[PDB]
Design a protein around this ligand. Structure first.
Ligand SMILES: Nc1ncnc2c1ncn2[C@@H]1O[C@H](CSc2ccc(Cl)c(C(=O)O)c2)[C@@H](O)[C@H]1O
Ligand SMILES: [Zn+2]
Ligand SMILES: [Zn+2]
Lengths: 298, 115
């Protein structure tokens, strides 16, 4: 596999076009581990490879870019993924992160609490989520679409993602949501991306590239998750840390992508085509204001 | 007049043989950077490692106030370069050392302003 020198593997288009039934995920390389560079944590390696893959897509990168990162804490009380995002994003990018549990972070602002308590006045150019509930991994009951934070994420995308913006949302065999797959059809392009360092896990990042705010294609999320598991079940991915050793072209290119305010009636097919090419962001350019709802009781 | 002196407490803990603070966030980078102490992106040279700044700050990590009137942190949101020989204890290194104000390197670990 030439794939071992890539940052990871994206779900091939033909697999997206199938109509598979959902099966249990049984990875050939389950339990194997990549050899990480000395002293480098899995979460730093994983986010580095995610960002290396996002470098290959037509991301909109405006001045004063706005990025929000959900699930950014660790059981060590630090934010390794936020540290990689801050390394990757252009200097001056506004980066906000959040987690249920307290942690210390390099983000410009951090909100502690359930993601459902997070509200923002502004729209965002990029949404990253690593949220995961390990209780979903119950091999003994039916693997149905999950709600919880996925319900929040779906609404947050529809209400607070700028047109032209993108997302990368962690899923696993058991941690997934049908509506989130359906929402992937509201972007110009989408994939499920597996990092080469964590290829022994059913984890992937569901990536929606350039948001259009309306269905471009109709996706059945139950079918699409079955398609994803079928791909993983029949395509073993060789664990690899190779791409971690060449960081010379890591930083996200500062593209100066135009930001315009438009009301829904002026989004014509010419605007939709600029959005689809990563050439336009549609949102206000006012002040970024966030808050966390606090439940007050005795 | 009472103030908790966490810096002294950590130094005394280290000198008594305590294990340094762990889980400082080490970054992947080229190791062909400027080598300056505290930077907006990782700048480790061949002799350094680069770390996320908040994770190397004693006050950030211990959840205590920063020792200045404004409570501002010099590390959070930045990257700190640590000599590889000292990278087992980034918090202790940043606590014990000083940045040269003209060249931006660590005094005694890159600053050549006095030779
Ligand atoms: N509804 C919600 N709102 C806000 N934050 C949320 C959230 N749900 C989860 N998180 C947060 O996401 C982060 C990553 S999840 C995780 C946790 C432990 C392990 Cl051990 C693993 C693993 O197996 O790798 C993965 C966690 O820090 C969690 O606190
Ligand atoms: Zn601090
Ligand atoms: Zn000097």
């Amino acid at each position: 596999s030439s794939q071992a020198w890539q940052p990871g593997v994206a779900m091939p288009n033909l697999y997206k076009m199938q109509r598979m039934l959902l099966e249990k995920c049984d990875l050939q390389n389950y339990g194997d581990s990549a050899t990480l560079p000395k002293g480098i944590m899995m979460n730093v390696a994983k986010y580095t490879q995610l960002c290396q893959y996002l470098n290959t897509l037509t991301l909109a990168v405006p001045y004063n870019m706005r990025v929000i990162h959900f699930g950014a804490g660790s059981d060590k009380g630090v934010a390794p993924g936020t540290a990689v995002l801050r390394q990757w994003l252009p200097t001056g990018t506004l980066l906000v992160d959040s987690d249920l549990n307290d942690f210390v972070s390099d983000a410009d602002s951090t909100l502690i609490g359930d993601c459902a308590t997070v509200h923002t006045a502004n729209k965002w150019d990029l949404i990253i989520s690593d949220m995961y509930d390990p209780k979903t991994k119950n091999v003994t009951k039916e693997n149905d679409s999950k709600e919880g934070f996925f319900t929040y994420i779906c609404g947050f995308i529809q209400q607070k993602l700028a047109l032209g913006g993108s997302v990368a949302i962690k899923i696993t065999e058991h941690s997934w949501n049908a509506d989130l797959y359906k929402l992937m059809g509201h972007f110009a392009w989408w994939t499920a991306f597996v990092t080469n360092v964590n290829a022994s896990s059913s984890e992937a990042f569901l990536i929606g590239c350039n948001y259009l705010g309306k269905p471009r294609e109709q996706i059945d999320g139950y079918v699409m998750h079955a398609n994803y598991i079928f791909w993983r079940n029949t395509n073993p991915i060789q664990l690899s840390s190779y791409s971690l050793f060449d960081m010379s072209k890591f930083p996200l290119k500062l593209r100066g992508t135009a930001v315009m305010s438009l009301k829904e009636g002026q989004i014509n097919d010419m605007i939709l085509s600029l959005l689809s090419k990563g050439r336009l962001i549609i949102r206000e350019n006012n002040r970024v204001v966030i808050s966390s709802d606090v439940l007050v009781n005795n | 007049a009472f103030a908790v002196d966490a810096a002294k407490a950590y130094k005394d803990y280290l000198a008594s043989g305590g294990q340094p603070i762990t889980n400082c966030v080490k970054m992947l980078c080229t190791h062909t950077g400027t080598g300056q102490a505290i930077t907006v992106t990782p700048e480790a040279n061949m002799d350094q490692e680069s770390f996320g700044g908040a994770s190397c700050c004693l006050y950030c990590r211990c959840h205590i106030d920063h020792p200045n009137p404004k409570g501002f942190c010099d590390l959070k949101g930045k990257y700190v370069q640590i000599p590889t020989t000292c990278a087992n204890d980034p918090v202790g290194f940043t606590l014990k050392n000083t940045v040269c104000t003209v060249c931006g390197m660590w005094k005694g670990y890159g600053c050549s302003c006095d030779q």
